[PDB]
Amino acid sequence: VKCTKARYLKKKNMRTLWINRITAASQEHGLKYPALIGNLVKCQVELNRKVLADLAIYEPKTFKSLAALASRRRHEGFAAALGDGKEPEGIFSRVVQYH
């Protein structure tokens, strides 16, 4: 019964491990984890957590690239919010659509 009921915990706490690892790398590059994954999903880079953690380990400066991209998007978002009126959108903030 434990061998059965443990598969759901397997998924649960492996996702927790990946979230912790990504938080470690993100803190290495100056960005908390909420900001990273949120503002990265706000650029249609639909990358899941397993690959992000595996990139934190086995590919450090492509992770640096993704973190820099996230910080860029965050700054563009804060600039847009600071826009008190009508403002052109940022350069990465643009949304690509598909039918």
């Binding site: 990504i22 938080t23 953690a53």
Partner: protein
């Protein structure tokens, strides 16, 4: 990169020393930073079963600054098994008795509550004042930032900002002061 196998493993899992000033910092924030660093939750390689803890060295723990009135109010409780041994002591008293115990107990509370807590608390080093043994000082690598920004007082406010800050009211011609 492109190292050999064993040197690559040693590079990955090697453990880095960390100094951490403590002057005019609240014990809890030092405790939080030390808690994350001791158990390895700053390495992307983290895992509980890997034991990737990294050493930590706090200094100036005598100049810890609790917030509010926590010196008078916060009380730490201990009890030897012998009757009447329920003793509990304020923070000021425990600071005078042994001025490395507030930060020690904070880091002890935050760490995970398992049979790895003792290893992590052994890899913590706490030194009350700026002194530090040389065989430790020549192991250090990094100096983590001070969490609380120490608000400087009038004494180090140079005249440029004293007179640049606008005078905001007009006392009458005559006054005692």
């Amino acid at each position: 990169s492109s190292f050999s196998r064993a040197p690559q493993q040693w590079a990955t899992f090697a453990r880095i020393w960390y100094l951490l000033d403590g002057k005019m910092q609240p014990p809890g924030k030092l405790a939080a930073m030390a808690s994350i660093r001791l158990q390895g939750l700053h390495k992307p390689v983290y895992h509980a079963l890997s034991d990737c803890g990294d050493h930590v060295v706090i200094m100036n723990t005598r100049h810890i600054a609790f917030s509010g009135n926590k010196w008078e109010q916060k009380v730490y409780s201990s009890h030897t098994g012998y009757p009447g041994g329920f003793r509990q002591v304020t923070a000021a008293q425990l600071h005078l008795r042994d001025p490395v115990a507030i930060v020690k107990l904070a880091i002890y509370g935050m760490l995970p509550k398992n049979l790895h807590r003792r290893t992590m608390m052994e890899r913590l080093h706490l030194f009350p004042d700026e002194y530090i043994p040389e065989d430790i000082l020549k192991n250090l690598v990094e100096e983590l930032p001070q969490p609380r920004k120490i608000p400087k007082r009038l004494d180090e406010y140079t005249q440029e900002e004293i007179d640049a800050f606008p005078r905001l009211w007009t006392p009458p011609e005559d006054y005692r002061l």
